[PDB]
């Protein structure tokens, strides 16, 4: 039950950490590598963002995850 102000900020923050910490780089490696082995027309996209969603959550440094779970709590409970 969020102040939609905070939502905008949480979204801006996640992006800033994920750039810094190399998460951005590694996800683009993964996609480029998957597509290179698949074929582009060959792929069935979302047969694709679905496949890697497990891997991407688990690539998140536990330090990043903790700061995020910090603010998400300080919001969901006011």
């Amino acid at each position: 039950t969020l102040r939609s102000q905070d939502k905008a900020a949480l979204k801006e923050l996640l992006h800033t950490r994920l750039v810094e910490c190399g998460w951005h780089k590694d996800i683009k490696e993964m996609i480029r590598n998957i597509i290179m082995e698949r074929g582009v027309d060959n792929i069935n996209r979302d047969q694709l963002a679905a496949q890697i969603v497990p891997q991407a959550r688990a690539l998140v440094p536990e330090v990043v995850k903790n700061e995020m779970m910090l603010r998400v709590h300080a919001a969901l409970d006011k």
């Binding site: 969020l2 949480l10 979204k11 996640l14 992006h15 994920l18 951005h24 996800i27 683009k28 996609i31 963002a49 890697i52 969603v53 991407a56 959550r57 998140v60 995850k65 995020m68 779970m69 998400v72 709590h73 969901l76 409970d77």
Partner: peptide
Amino acid sequence: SLDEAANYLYQSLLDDAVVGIFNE
């Protein structure tokens, strides 16, 4: 109770960050 709900927020914002990349 909010526990499960905090996990839905984080997981939704994160799946939305993957698409972020994915579009460009």
